Design a protein around this nucleic acid. Structure first.
Lengths: 75, 186, 176, 124, 96, 92, 119
RNA sequence: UAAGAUAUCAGAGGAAAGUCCUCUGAUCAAACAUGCGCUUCCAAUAGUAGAAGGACGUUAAGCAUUUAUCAUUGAACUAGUUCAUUGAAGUCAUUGAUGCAAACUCCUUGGUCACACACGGCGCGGAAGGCGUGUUUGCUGACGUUCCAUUCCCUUGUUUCAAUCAUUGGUUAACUGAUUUUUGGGGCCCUUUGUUUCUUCUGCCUGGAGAAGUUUGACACCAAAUAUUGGUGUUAGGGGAGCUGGGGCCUUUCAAAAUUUUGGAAGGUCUUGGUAGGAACGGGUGGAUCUUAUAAUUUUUGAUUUAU
């Protein structure tokens, strides 16, 4: 029905938790009414900060049925 | 509280004091990652289709779907409705009762009062040219006036001027009912 | 249709933004501020009028309380009680708005006072208050020696009015 | 204990202290105040009650006593997706006769406000 | 679309579509096997079905197997008349 | 529906959450929409195994909320009045 | 068609709602909602024992059974009796309806006939 | 977010098929009344108690358990162990957490009613259901428009006895019963805690009082900025007359059927409810419900029985 208002968030670095355990940080470009979201320069965070962390791709789009939370780690 | 980023002033904002933080309690259900419905669903096996015969011999005749026969009663009744209509469509060049002069001279008049007469019908329709014939139609099964008549004028231009005038004029009032006019149709 | 039941009025032109112009409108804010101020006092002012359950007293306790003398009760007049409830209600308003902040007054010229007590410019709260001067740059170069006709004496300890005549009448030493 | 009306839906039993079950096996017990199309509900002074993992061997089939660890959380708004069933616990503080009395005095008082508002809006 | 238009569409998809397997199983009195997402299978005869795939069944024979450390048992539970919610099912076969 | 209309009544007051993953957030609630999804500001976030942190700004899909705890003084806001007398509307 | 409109006519019957958990609920049925929210009366909700030499039963449902406040202390086997249980629709897996009632009277939906009789 | 709808069924009627509309049946529902030898519950005072529920209370560092990071490099070492250095993350807690049990303290609830201290009911209530008849209505509520509507009295500690006073009735001035006024005596309550908590004003424990008022109104309270405006709430309880609804019973009158049953009218008696709003009509009116868009990520057409 209504579009989720993340208008203030876009172009900032954003951590979000995919389903349960996986955490994905990137720079948020765009969003839609289902909360499927797309972001640039993604990186999958893990327990060891430089070691297990690996980059995903140039552009990646996430389905909104696996967003739980979406914290804005910038201003 | 100190900051209170709210529409209200500082007194009203301090008025909505929240109950203190929720105590932590170690969770009892399954973790959200591990959550799943039963996997390893063993498919409809050949061994299952081998054990069908124990069920099949036990209930060889299935029970009758009598709720379906309520639908087979109605749909077959609608087809029989068409056949009684098919008995009627085979039976207008025959009827004797519609078989005088040119069908371009014939007005249909309809919705006429049950309790009209041919003389009042003649008065009104003779308004639009000399009449060659009338007939009110009556139910041949028992002579209820059917509420229609056929009126043959000496000219089809007077039949179409009678049509003009006394049907598209809302329906000619004769006695107490609003009488459509058409051309013969039939 | 849509309406705001604090104001009791329907919206004239229904859009989404006309709602938001009414939702953060000055008239509407003053209503909803005032609406909860009334429901606040009404739970306290309408005090729980409890229901009594009277037991048939004993033969024993009726004789032990008969020998005990009847105490005098004190009932004030209607004019008297209308004033004393005006006072006691205005007193409980005061204990709401005390907020004993002597401790902020004591650490005024200290070396981190800008960063902890100014509270526009902490870390925890500081980002939130800038939305809704004495800056963070202040160091201990300005005002090197506090006592240079600058500081004010510590404001003396407060005391109860009712019992203002329990105080010892004379000081021990001669003040200036 | 308490006997609920044999045909009483969720709309009827406002103010009845309920006993709502979620999918995880946690129960919220409080006074109901609203509900909805998809059955999410507002309890007034609810308490979540959980059977901890250690106690749960005790409920397996053999007077049992269960240490139920509960935590207060006043005035929640639950979600529908999570509810599994409901059961009634207590009946409301006010009578059935007295809940009609408070309705008719409030129905009278609500009407008096509008006519006093309409005539204060009409002339001024 | 109109309300009458959907009534035509529903009669089509039941008659000339994937659910025609169920509809042709109801009319011809042929028993079906159903697999629920429970991981246990019921051998039954259909008496009605619907859009959501829920269905009223008759002479139901459920067949449920369980295991605990590689020890198996095959349990059989008989029911006269049953009403099955439609989300539970994953695969319906029609017996020969 | 009142359950959702209440959540709009709680803007700019401290609330709690409990996401269906089993976390617990509690900070001041800035935004809410009709699908019960919320933006909290200046929060304290408690992971399901007890670990607590602080984060400035957070958004949550409404679908994962298990309950919200609201300040207790809204228990008598006027959503809950049974017999209400609205005036006659103005003509459009 | 809605086959939930069949359940609405099955009112005042003995029934067994059998849930997604594995919890069976034997009781007297009342008004079923359009979303299948069945609401019962004189109920007895239980868990079966999957035998197999002490295989552990549904851990979540045993908690939810005791929490209802219907389980009596000297219930040796795992049952819980109470009055009035309102049950959210999506949780229903099966409904074991009784042997006595005739389907043929009840499976004739009225809106099914009222579409054909009107045309 | 939208559209549509306001019980279903069957029969007769009005404008061969169907729709629209109307009165007659059945079933369904709601509200209101009103019954059932209906079901369950409603706490010592002839005593210092006790029942249900709590305590996010104490004893208590109780008792009994089990827990406190990983990687890299060197030394010693048995053939794992300790020490030191470098990196990674790191809820708080160890007076903890987990299991077991008791004692004490304290909180909220109610008919702490009337009669009786008497060798498997049929006292007056209130609370909660189940079941049955009857009436109204067929979603419900404001609002407007024409109409029908149309009352009073006493009391606000209570009860009981005595004294007198007045009024009314029975009988032969006297007696008896009922009711009211002034005093006195006794009983219980005053937490009514802002000393009757329907307002306002006067006022009180050697007393229970006096004055004014009651809904297009009055009163209380809250909020301001320099009196006004905007908000929340109060306007009660008890008894009697009247007036009217419902229930059972009695006698009379009438109709049908074979002295009786069924229905209708009136009078009498018992019991119970209401007592200031109600009817029609009208709207680009509110809310509820229902059907369909809607089984396609944000609730209800399955990723929580931890399973191979």
């Amino acid at each position: 029905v209504s579009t989720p208002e993340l208008k203030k968030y876009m172009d900032k670095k954003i951590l979000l938790n995919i389903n349960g355990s996986r955490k994905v940080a990137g720079i948020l470009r765009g969003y839609d009414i289902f909360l499927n979201v797309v972001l640039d320069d993604a990186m999958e965070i893990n327990g060891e900060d430089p070691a297990n962390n690996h980059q995903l791709g140039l552009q990646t789009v996430i389905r909104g049925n696996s967003i739980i939370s979406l914290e804005a780690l910038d201003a | 509280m100190n900051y209170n980023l709210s529409k209200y002033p500082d007194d009203v904002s301090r008025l909505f004091k929240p109950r203190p933080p929720l105590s932590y309690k170690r969770p009892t259900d399954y973790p959200y990652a591990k959550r799943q419905t039963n996997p390893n669903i063993t498919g409809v096996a050949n061994l299952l289709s081998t054990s069908l015969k124990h069920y099949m011999e036990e209930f060889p005749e299935g029970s009758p779907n009598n709720h379906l026969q309520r639908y087979e009663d109605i749909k077959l009744s609608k087809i029989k409705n068409a056949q009684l209509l098919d008995r009627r469509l085979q039976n207008p060049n025959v009827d004797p009762h519609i078989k005088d002069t040119d069908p371009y001279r014939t007005i249909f008049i309809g919705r006429l009062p049950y309790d009209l007469d041919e003389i009042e019908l003649q008065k009104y329709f003779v308004k639009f040219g000399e009449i060659e014939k009338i007939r009110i139609v009556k139910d041949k099964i028992t002579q209820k006036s059917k509420g229609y008549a056929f009126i043959v004028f000496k000219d089809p231009i007077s039949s179409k001027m009678a049509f003009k005038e006394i049907g598209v004029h809302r329906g000619i009032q004769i006695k107490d009912r609003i009488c459509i006019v058409d051309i013969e149709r039939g | 249709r849509y309406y705001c039941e604090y104001c009791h009025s329907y919206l004239t032109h229904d859009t989404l933004s006309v709602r938001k112009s009414h939702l953060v409108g000055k008239n509407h804010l003053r209503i909803t501020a005032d609406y909860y101020r009334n429901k606040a006092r009404d739970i306290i002012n309408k005090h729980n009028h409890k229901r009594r359950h009277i037991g048939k007293r004993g033969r024993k306790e009726r004789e032990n309380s008969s020998q005990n003398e009847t105490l005098k009760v004190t009932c004030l007049s209607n004019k008297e009680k209308r004033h004393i409830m005006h006072v006691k209600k205005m007193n409980q308003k005061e204990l709401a708005q005390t907020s004993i902040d002597t401790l902020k007054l004591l650490y005024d010229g200290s070396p981190g006072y800008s960063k902890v007590f100014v509270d526009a410019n902490r870390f925890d709260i500081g980002d939130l208050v800038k939305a809704s001067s004495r800056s963070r740059d202040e160091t201990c170069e300005s005002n090197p020696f506090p006592r240079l006709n600058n500081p004010k004496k510590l404001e003396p300890p407060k005391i109860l009015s009712q019992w203002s005549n329990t105080i010892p009448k004379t000081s021990i030493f001669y003040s200036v | 204990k308490i006997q609920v009306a044999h045909s009483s839906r969720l709309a009827n039993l406002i103010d009845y202290k309920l006993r709502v079950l979620t999918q995880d096996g946690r129960v919220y017990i409080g006074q109901l105040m609203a509900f909805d199309k998809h059955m999410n509900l507002v309890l007034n002074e609810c308490i979540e009650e959980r059977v901890p993992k250690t106690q749960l061997d005790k409920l397996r089939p053999r007077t049992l006593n269960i240490k139920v660890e509960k935590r207060v959380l006043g005035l929640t708004i639950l979600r529908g997706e999570q509810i599994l069933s409901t059961v009634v616990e207590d009946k409301p503080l006010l009578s059935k006769k007295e809940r009609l009395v408070r309705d008719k005095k409030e129905k009278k008082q609500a009407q008096k406000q509008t006519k006093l508002r309409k005539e204060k809006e009409k002339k001024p | 679309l109109s309300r009458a238009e959907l009534e035509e569409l529903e009669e089509f998809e039941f008659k000339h579509g994937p659910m025609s397997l169920i509809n042709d199983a109801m009319v011809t009195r042929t028993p079906v096997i159903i697999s629920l997402r429970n991981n246990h299978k019921i051998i039954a005869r259909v008496k009605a079905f619907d859009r959501h795939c829920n269905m009223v069944l008759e002479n139901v024979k459920e067949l449920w197997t369980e295991k605990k450390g590689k020890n198996v048992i095959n349990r059989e539970r008989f029911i006269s008349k049953l009403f099955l919610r439609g989300d539970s099912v994953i695969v319906v076969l029609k017996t020969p | 529906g009142i359950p959702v209309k209440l959540l709009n009544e709680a803007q700019g007051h401290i609330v709690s959450l409990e996401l269906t993953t089993g976390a617990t957030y509690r900070g001041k609630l800035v935004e809410s929409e009709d699908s019960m999804n919320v933006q909290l500001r200046d929060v304290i976030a408690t992971e399901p195994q007890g670990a607590v942190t602080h984060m400035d700004q957070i958004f949550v899909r409404g679908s994962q909320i298990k309950f919200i705890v609201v300040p207790d003084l809204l228990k008598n806001a006027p959503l809950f009045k049974k017999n209400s007398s609205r005036p006659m509307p103005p003509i459009r | 068609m809605k086959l939930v409109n069949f359940l609405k006519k099955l009112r005042n019957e003995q029934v067994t709602i059998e849930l997604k958990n594995g919890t069976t609920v034997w009781g007297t049925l009342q008004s079923v909602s359009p979303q299948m929210n069945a609401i019962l009366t004189d109920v007895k909700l239980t868990l079966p024992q999957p035998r197999l030499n002490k295989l552990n039963s549904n851990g979540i449902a045993m908690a939810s059974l005791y929490l209802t406040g219907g389980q009596q202390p000297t219930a040796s086997d795992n049952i819980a009796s109470l009055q009035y249980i309102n049950i959210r629709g999506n949780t229903i897996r099966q409904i074991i309806l009784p042997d006595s009632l005739n389907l043929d009277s009840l499976l004739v939906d009225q809106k099914q006939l009222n579409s054909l009789r009107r045309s």
